[PDB]
Structures are given as structure tokens and as C-alpha cells.
Amino acid sequence: SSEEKEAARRSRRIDRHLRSESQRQRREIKLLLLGGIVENKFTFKELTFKMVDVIHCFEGVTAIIFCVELWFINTSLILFLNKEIYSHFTCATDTSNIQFVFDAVTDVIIQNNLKYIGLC
Amino acid sequence: KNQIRDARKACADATLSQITNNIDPVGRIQMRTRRTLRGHLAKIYAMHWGTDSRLLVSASQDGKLIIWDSYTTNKVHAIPLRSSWVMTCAYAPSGNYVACGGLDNICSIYNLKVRVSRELAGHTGYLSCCRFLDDNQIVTSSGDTTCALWDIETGQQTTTFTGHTGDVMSLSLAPDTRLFVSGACDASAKLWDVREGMCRQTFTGHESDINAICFFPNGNAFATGSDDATCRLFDLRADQELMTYSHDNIICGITSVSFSKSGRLLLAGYDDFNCNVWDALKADRAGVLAGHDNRVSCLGVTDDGMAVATGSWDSFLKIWN
Amino acid sequence: YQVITSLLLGTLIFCAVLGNACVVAAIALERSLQNVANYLIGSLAVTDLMVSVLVLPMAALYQVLNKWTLGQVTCDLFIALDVLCCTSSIWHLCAIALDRYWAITDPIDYVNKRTPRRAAALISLTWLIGFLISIPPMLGWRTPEDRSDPDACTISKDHGYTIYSTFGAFYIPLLLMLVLYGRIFRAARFRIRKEAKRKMALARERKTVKTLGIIMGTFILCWLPFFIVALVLPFCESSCHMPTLLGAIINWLGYSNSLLNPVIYAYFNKDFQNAFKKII
Amino acid sequence: LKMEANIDRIKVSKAAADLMAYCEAHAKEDPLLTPVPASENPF
Numbered sequence: 001s002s003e004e005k006e007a008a009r010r011s012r013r014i015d016r017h018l019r020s021e022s023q024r025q026r027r028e029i030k031l032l033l034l035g036g037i038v039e040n041k042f043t044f045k046e047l048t049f050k051m052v053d054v055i056h057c058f059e060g061v062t063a064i065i066f067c068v069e070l071w072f073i074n075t076s077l078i079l080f081l082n083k084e085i086y087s088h089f090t091c092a093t094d095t096s097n098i099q100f101v102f103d104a105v106t107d108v109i110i111q112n113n114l115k116y117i118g119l120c
Numbered sequence: 121k122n123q124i125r126d127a128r129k130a131c132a133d134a135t136l137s138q139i140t141n142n143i144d145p146v147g148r149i150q151m152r153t154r155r156t157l158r159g160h161l162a163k164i165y166a167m168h169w170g171t172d173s174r175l176l177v178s179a180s181q182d183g184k185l186i187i188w189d190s191y192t193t194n195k196v197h198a199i200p201l202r203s204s205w206v207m208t209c210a211y212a213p214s215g216n217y218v219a220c221g222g223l224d225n226i227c228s229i230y231n232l233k234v235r236v237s238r239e240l241a242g243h244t245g246y247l248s249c250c251r252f253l254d255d256n257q258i259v260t261s262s263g264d265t266t267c268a269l270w271d272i273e274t275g276q277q278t279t280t281f282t283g284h285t286g287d288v289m290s291l292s293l294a295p296d297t298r299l300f301v302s303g304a305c306d307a308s309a310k311l312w313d314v315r316e317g318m319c320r321q322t323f324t325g326h327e328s329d330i331n332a333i334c335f336f337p338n339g340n341a342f343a344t345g346s347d348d349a350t351c352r353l354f355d356l357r358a359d360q361e362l363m364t365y366s367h368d369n370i371i372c373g374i375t376s377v378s379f380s381k382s383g384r385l386l387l388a389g390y391d392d393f394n395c396n397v398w399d400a401l402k403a404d405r406a407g408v409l410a411g412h413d414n415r416v417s418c419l420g421v422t423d424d425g426m427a428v429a430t431g432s433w434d435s436f437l438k439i440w441n
Numbered sequence: 442y443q444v445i446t447s448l449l450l451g452t453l454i455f456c457a458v459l460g461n462a463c464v465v466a467a468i469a470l471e472r473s474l475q476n477v478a479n480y481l482i483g484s485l486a487v488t489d490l491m492v493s494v495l496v497l498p499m500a501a502l503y504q505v506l507n508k509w510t511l512g513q514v515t516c517d518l519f520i521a522l523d524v525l526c527c528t529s530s531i532w533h534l535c536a537i538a539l540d541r542y543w544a545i546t547d548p549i550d551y552v553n554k555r556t557p558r559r560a561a562a563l564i565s566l567t568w569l570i571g572f573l574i575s576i577p578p579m580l581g582w583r584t585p586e587d588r589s590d591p592d593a594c595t596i597s598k599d600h601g602y603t604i605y606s607t608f609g610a611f612y613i614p615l616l617l618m619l620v621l622y623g624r625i626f627r628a629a630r631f632r633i634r635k636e637a638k639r640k641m642a643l644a645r646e647r648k649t650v651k652t653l654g655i656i657m658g659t660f661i662l663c664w665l666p667f668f669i670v671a672l673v674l675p676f677c678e679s680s681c682h683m684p685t686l687l688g689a690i691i692n693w694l695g696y697s698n699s700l701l702n703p704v705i706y707a708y709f710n711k712d713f714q715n716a717f718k719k720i721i
Numbered sequence: 722l723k724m725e726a727n728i729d730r731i732k733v734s735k736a737a738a739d740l741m742a743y744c745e746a747h748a749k750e751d752p753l754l755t756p757v758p759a760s761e762n763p764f
């Protein structure tokens with residue numbers, strides 16, 4: 001049973017690494033620019049954002065950023081002009097674009113918590 | 121093409137169902153979850169069995185390719201994956217290699233006895249399925265309507281199997297490892313020989329895209345699952361459809377189909393969070409493997425036929441025996 | 442007529458020990474019901490189970506026989522147990538409200554720092570505040586064998602212990618819950634407010650007057666009648682005779698919160714109504 | 722197209738006979754079909 005104990009120790013360490021990785025994945029907000037695959041990550045005001053630039057591989061996402069040049073029922077749409085929809089005429093001059101994405105994602109979180117309690 | 125249309129009715133004589141009217145039913149098969157493999161933090165899209173019928177490998181969306189010892193429920197190895205987008209996994213006949221792949225258009229081979237020993241590039245679409253032909257050759261099927269055999273030594277497409285008009289999403293290698301059959305979006309499945317890139321045969325019976333396929337253990341037949349909420353058992357030698365496995369209570373697509381060791385029982389996974397067992401000779405539901413919280417994505421039968429393992433989107437593998 | 446009271450009170454103690462046990466079983470036998478929120482609605486169910494199995498059976502013997510037929514020590518443990526279980530139940534209702542509060546107002550806390558450990562800490566504070574009102578004031582101030590034997594199970598009508606217990610078990614918790622559910626209403630009303638749109642406005646600011654009315658009405662219509670009496674009579678000994686009938690209806694109204702809690706917090710939301718169906 | 726039609730095809734009767742032959746001959750060694758003892762079950 002010495003070999004069995006060695007294998008059990010191997011299992012224990014892997015489980016600990018996976019637990020750390022899960023702790024780090026729960027606090028990530030996944031968004032998709034839907035206007036090879038590209039990935040970007042950045043933190044803004046203590047909130048990490050994980051955007052992918054490209055139908056069932058993407059299912060557990062928070063919002064779908066979708067730019068317009070002047071599982072969808074359960075995902076909000078941040079409509080940029082270069083379930084509730086949020087629209088903001090783009091303004092590359094300032095960093096308001098990022099502030100909008102933050103204010104929208106923060107409201108999707110608050111409204112999903114006002115439905116679990118059963119108050120909406 | 122005129123000859124093809126005529127030959128089918130000419131050789132279609134007595135329905136296989138008519139021939140099987142004499143065979144006695146299998147009764148009722150009740151399978152019970154023996155073990156529960158847990159540790160994936162996200163949806164599991166694929167799982168492959170080792171030829172030893174003991175070790176297996178699973179691929180999930182948390183960039184994780186985990187090797188598990190099914191008997192002792194122990195994580196042997198946890199291999200992190202560059203892409204978090206992963207649709208396929210495999211496990212070499214030898215036991216010294218696994219292979220994954222996904223949205224990234226690269227098939228990533230890992231040497232077991234863990235670091236990427238080779239990356240295979242060239243496909244212009246998501247890898248849907250891959251199967252180790254031997255210790256040195258691999259067959260892959262991609263979302264740009266092209267299948268390919270790869271030499272690992274150099275790292276190039278040796279041949280390229282083209283002709284499908286839709287995204288090839290399922291791939292089955294024959295027991296003799298001489299031929300392979302591919303199922304794609306065009307509701308058609310094509311037989312190909314690895315020797316020459318010449319489509320040996322084409323079968324058109326389904327109504328929707330084909331998501332699963334698996335050879336019969338004899339190697340002369342195959343079964344195909346589609347989004348048409350039906351499965352179909354074709355025959356290589358007969359070059360046509362013989363039986364259809366569909367039930368009205370089922371309207372969702374099939375994600376995975378597998379045969380028993382003798383090929384009598386046809387396990388099939390569905391989107392109703394259930395797995396229906398069918399009589400491959402009688403088109404009769406021999407049982408149900410209910411118990412998965414999310415959709416059953418991939419299903420496997422051990423080489424010795426001892427047990428069947430089901431992976432699912434609920435981040436849990438279930439061994440049933 | 443001792444038979445009539447026995448089967449009425451008996452059914453109440455059965456429905457409670459069954460309803461509160463079904464709730465905790467569902468949390469354990471389902472993985473869809475395993476979040477920080479339901480760990481607090483399972484702990485409350487467990488506390489009500491303890492109330493329904495330990496305190497309630499021996500309160501019913503005291504009512505049907507009209508006398509304590511057990512030892513003086515038994516009376517002391519059951520007065521202590523009764524206080525402990527009730528106080529923890531009231532503070533569990535106040536912890537669930539404190540968590541709900543920080544979902545609607547602090548989204549960063551909800552995402553970057555909300556752990557199952559939070560549930561553990563909210564439950565630990567509820568039980569620490571229970572063992573402060575029950576077990577310190579008993580051990581230490583105990584008269585030396587100078588009491589009557591029957592009808593002896595009565596909480597002290599001392600003036601210091603009256604304020605200490607009543608304020609630390611109901612009046613301090615009630616005020617906090619009224620402030621917290623008032624702020625949750627304003628926040629919800631704002632977000633909802635900010636012809637078809639006007640229709641689904643009225644029908645979202647009238648399922649947020651119901652839920653909050655149900656919760657507050659259940660908690661106040663049960664406990665307030667009892668804590669008002671428990672606060673006024675100790676100070677007004679002369680000329681405030683309390684009838685038996687009304688004085689017993691109020692005690693059992695207070696106890697009925699243990700039965701009603703699983704219905705208000707558990708038997709109503711969809712996630713439980715679905716899990717019970719899969720199991721049964 | 723022409724070479725796919727050129728292949729020779731056996732009548733569904735002999736394919737059925739071969740499919741039955743393979744199924745009955747290997748029936749006894751299928752643990753799933755014939756319920757296997759707990760002494761063999763390795764899980």
C-alpha cells in the first residue's frame with residue numbers, strides 16, 4: 001500500500017493546485033467583442049476583465065460587447081455606436097468607453113441579485 | 121450517378137428488422153454509478169479511454185487536461201492547456217502520448233512518460249475530433265471541411281481528406297486502423313482510406329448535421345448520431361442504411377454514440393440530461409443512464425467492455441459498469 | 442379536552458420537525474442549492490429543527506398537565522435551552538438580511554470577496570450572541586434550593602434581566618432589520634424605475650411591496666406580541682393580571698415562527714420548489 | 722461518383738447473417754449484455 005499512499009499524495013497536491021485556480025477564475029468577468037481567436041485581460045477599479053475577440057463554446061459569459069459602424073436571451077448586449085441593452089455613442093477621445101462597460105457590468109450583477117432574493 | 125440510385129433498391133431485399141423478428145429481447149439492463157470522478161472546474165467537452173481499460177483522460181474549458189486512474193479515483197496527472205478553448209482529447213494506443221485541440225487551430229501532442237513535444241498546424245478551422253492512428257501517425261478533423269493525416273516526425277499534413285461540404289465534427293477509426301469514417305454538417309458520412317486520400321464511400325441518410333459516429337466492433341458497420349434526434353446503423357459492405365434508432369419522447373440531438381464489446385448494446389447520449397441504451401439488433405430502449413446534471417458531451421466504452429464512462433458539461437465524469 | 446389540546450399541539454410539533462428536516466436534506470442532496478445564500482437558509486432551518494425537537498415537546502407537556510412534573514434542574518436547562526434557541530433563530534433572520542443587503546449595494550464585495558466562509562462567520566456571530574443572553578446569566582445567579590415545585594418553569598421577572606434579555610434578543614435585532622429592509626426597498630424601487638414599459642413597472646414595484654410585507658409581517662405578527670408582554674408585565678406587577686387563554690395563545694404564536702420560517706424563506710423561491718420535485 | 726458506384730455490394734441478407742454471427746459468437750464475453758459477478762467487477 002506504499003505505492004497507493006504515494007498516488008494519494010500525488011492526487012492531494014493536484015487538488016490543491018486546482019482549488020487555487022478555481023479561486024482565481026470565479027473573480028473574472030468574461031466579455032466577447034462580436035461586431036485565430038484573440039484574448040485580452042486587464043483590471044479596472046478592482047475588477048478584472050477577460051475579453052475574447054472572435055456559439056456553444058461561449059455560453060457562461062457576462063455580456064456581449066457589439067460595435068456598429070454608423071444563450072443570447074440570458075446575456076446582456078453593450079451596443080457601441082462607432083434582457084436589457086446598453087448603448088453609448090463611442091468616444092475614443094476619453095476613457096469613458098471603459099467606464100460604460102464597468103457601469104453596465106456592475107448593474108447586470110445588482111439586478112441578478114435582486115431576482116434571487118425575489119424582489120424583481 | 122445514375123447507377124448509384126438504381127443499385128440501392130436492387131440490393132435492398134429483406135429489412136434487417138424482419139430478419140431479427142426471431143431473435144429474443146435483451147430484457148432490461150440496469151446500470152448503477154460505481155464511481156464519481158470530480159475536480160474539473162468547468163464544462164467537460166471530451167474524454168478518451170486508455171487501451172488498458174483503466175486510465176482515462178478528460179479535457180475541460182478551464183484549460184485542463186486531467187489523467188485519472190478510474191479504479192482508485194486518483195488524479196495521476198493534471199496538464200494545463202495553452203488555450204482554454206478545447207473540444208477534443210485522445211490517448212495513444214501505446215499510453216505514452218495524449219493529444220488535444222479546439223478553437224485554436226493547433227493539435228497539441230503531450231508526451232506522458234509533461235511538456236508539449238509537438239504542435240501540429242495547418243488547419244483553417246476549429247479541431248473537432250482527433251484519433252491516434254498509431255504511435256507516430258494521427259488523424260484529425262477540422263471545421264474547415266478538411267480531415268488530415270499527420271506525420272509527427274516532421275509535423276506536416278501527409279495527406280488531406282477533402283470533399284465534405286460541411287464542418288466535419290465526428291471521426292471514427294476502424295479496429296484494423298486501415299479505414300476511417302467521418303461525419304460532418306451536410307447530414308452525410310464519408311468512408312476514407314488512410315493509404316490514399318480517395319473517399320471510398322459516401323452515406324446519406326440523416327436529415328441534420330452529424331455530431332457522433334463510432335465503428336461497429338466487427339469493422340464492417342457504423343452508427344451515426346445527429347441533431348435529427350435519431351441514430352442510424354449503416355453497413356459498409358451493403359453501402360446503405362439498415363436500421364433507424366429513434367423514439368418520439370426524444371426530440372433533442374445526439375452528442376455521442378458507442379458500442380458494447382460485442383456490439384449488441386448501443387449507448388447514446390442526449391440533451392435531455394439522459395443516456396438511452398438501445399438494442400443494436402432490435403431498435404428497442406433497453407435502459408436509461410440518468411444522473412448527469414448537465415448535457416452529456418462525450419461517452420466511452422472500455423476496450424474490454426467492462427464499463428462505460430460518461431463525461432458531461434456538469435464538470436463530473438461517471439463510470440457505470 | 443386534554444385530548445383536543447394534545448393532538449392540536451402535537452400536529453404543530455410534527456409539521457415543524459418534518460418541514461425543517463426536508464429543507465436541510467434538499468441542500469445536502471443537491472448541488473444546485475450549494476451557495477453562500479442557501480447555507481444561511483439551511484442553518485436557520487437547523488436552528489428551528491432544534492427548537493421543534495428539544496424545547497417544543499416539553500413546553501406541550503407543561504401546558505396539557507398545567508404543572509412541571511420533572512426536577513428543578515430540568516426546568517433550569519429547558520429555560521436556558523429555550524432562550525438560546527429562540528435568540529439564535531431571531532439573529533439568523535438578521536444575518537440573511539445583512540447578506541442580501543450587501544448584494545444590492547456592494548457588487549465588488551459580492552464578486553471579489555464573497556466566500557462560503559462568510560456564511561460560517563455570520564452563523565458563528567448568531568450563536569455567540571445566543572450563548573451571551575442564555576448561559577452567562579444562568580450559571581452564577583441561581584437561588585439555593587428555595588423554590589416551589591409545580592408550575593415552576595418561569596423566566597425571572599427581575600428588572601435588569603428583563604431589559605438585558607428583551608433588548609439583546611428582539612429590540613436590537615428588530616431595529617437593525619427595519620433599517621436594512623428599508624434601504625433594500627429604496628434601492629430596488631430606484632433600479633426598477635430606472636405604455637407597455639409602464640405596465641411592467643407597476644408589476645415590479647408591487648412584487649417588492651409583497652415580499653418585504655410578507656417577511657416583516659411574519660416576523661412582527663409572531664414575536665412582537667410576546668416581547669411586548671415580556672417587557673411590560675415585569676415592571677407593572679400590580680394591576681396587570683394576564684389571562685391564561687391570551688397568555689398562552691401569545692407564547693404559541695411566538696413558537697410558530699419556527700414552523701413559518703421554512704415556508705417563507707425556503708418553500709417559496711423557485712430553486713427549492715424545483716429540487717424537491719427532482720428528489721420526490 | 723463513378724468509382725463509388727463501381728464497388729461490389731453484398732445483399733443485405735448476408736450482411737445480416739454476418740452481423741448476427743458476430744453478435745451471437747461474442748455474446749458470452751460481453752460484461753454489459755450478460756450481467757457479470759461482483760467478484761470480477763474491478764470498481
Ligand SMILES: C/C=C\C/C=C\C/C=C/C/C=C/CCCC(=O)O[C@H](COC(=O)CCCCCCCCCCCCC)COP(=O)(O)O[C@H]1[C@H](O)[C@@H](O)[C@H](OP(=O)(O)O)[C@@H](O)[C@H]1O
Binds near residue numbers: 118705708709710
Ligand atoms: C386585497 C388585495 C390584495 C391582497 C390579497 C391577496 C394577495 C395576497 C395576500 C396575502 C398572501 C399571503 C401568502 C402568499 C403566498 C404566495 O403567494 O406564495 C407563492 C405561491 O406559492 C405557492 O402557492 C406554494 C406555497 C407552498 C407553501 C408550503 C406548503 C407546505 C407547508 C407545510 C410544510 C411542512 C410539511 C410539508 C410563492 O411566492 P410568491 O408568489 O409570494 O412571491 C415570492 C415570495 O413572496 C418570496 O418570499 C420568495 O422569495 P424567498 O424569500 O426566497 O422565499 C420569492 O421567490 C417568490 O416566491
Ligand SMILES: CC(C)CCC[C@@H](C)[C@H]1CC[C@H]2[C@@H]3CC=C4C[C@@H](O)CC[C@]4(C)[C@H]3CC[C@]12C
Binds near residue numbers: 449450452453456704
Ligand atoms: C394548525 C396546526 C395545529 C397544524 C399545522 C397547520 C399548517 C401546516 C398550516 C396551517 C396554515 C397553513 C398556511 C395557510 C396559507 C398559506 C398561503 C399559501 O399561499 C401557501 C401555504 C400557506 C402558507 C399555508 C402553509 C401550511 C399552514 C401553515
Ligand SMILES: CC(C)CCC[C@@H](C)[C@H]1CC[C@H]2[C@@H]3CC=C4C[C@@H](O)CC[C@]4(C)[C@H]3CC[C@]12C
Binds near residue numbers: 450451454458501505
Ligand atoms: C413530533 C410530534 C409528533 C410531537 C411528538 C411529541 C408529542 C406526541 C407528545 C409531547 C408531549 C406529549 C404529552 C405529554 C403528557 C401527556 C399527559 C398524559 O395523559 C399522556 C398524554 C399527554 C397529553 C402527551 C401526549 C403526546 C405529547 C403531546
Ligand SMILES: CC(C)CCC[C@@H](C)[C@H]1CC[C@H]2[C@@H]3CC=C4C[C@@H](O)CC[C@]4(C)[C@H]3CC[C@]12C
Binds near residue numbers: 652655657658659697
Ligand atoms: C402567524 C400567523 C398566525 C399569522 C400570519 C399573518 C401573515 C400571513 C400576514 C400578516 C400581515 C400580512 C401582510 C399585510 C399586507 C400586505 C400588503 C399587500 O399589498 C400584500 C399582502 C401583504 C404583504 C400581507 C401578506 C400576509 C401577511 C404577512
Ligand SMILES: CC(C)CCC[C@@H](C)[C@H]1CC[C@H]2[C@@H]3CC=C4C[C@@H](O)CC[C@]4(C)[C@H]3CC[C@]12C
Binds near residue numbers: 446450686694697701
Ligand atoms: C399558520 C400558523 C402560524 C398557525 C399557528 C396556530 C397556533 C398559534 C395555534 C393553533 C392551535 C392553538 C392552541 C389550541 C388550544 C390551546 C389550549 C388553550 O387552553 C390555550 C391555547 C392553546 C394551547 C392554543 C395556542 C395557539 C395554537 C397553538
Ligand SMILES: O=C1CC2(CCCC2)CC(=O)N1CCCCN1CCN(c2ncccn2)CC1
Binds near residue numbers: 499503504525528595
Ligand atoms: O411553556 C413553557 C415551558 C418551558 C420549559 C420547556 C421549554 C419552555 C419554560 C417556559 O418558559 N414556558 C413558557 C414559554 C415562555 C416563552 N419562551 C419563549 C422564549 N423566550 C425568550 N427567548 C429569548 C429571549 C427572551 N425570552 C422566553 C421563553
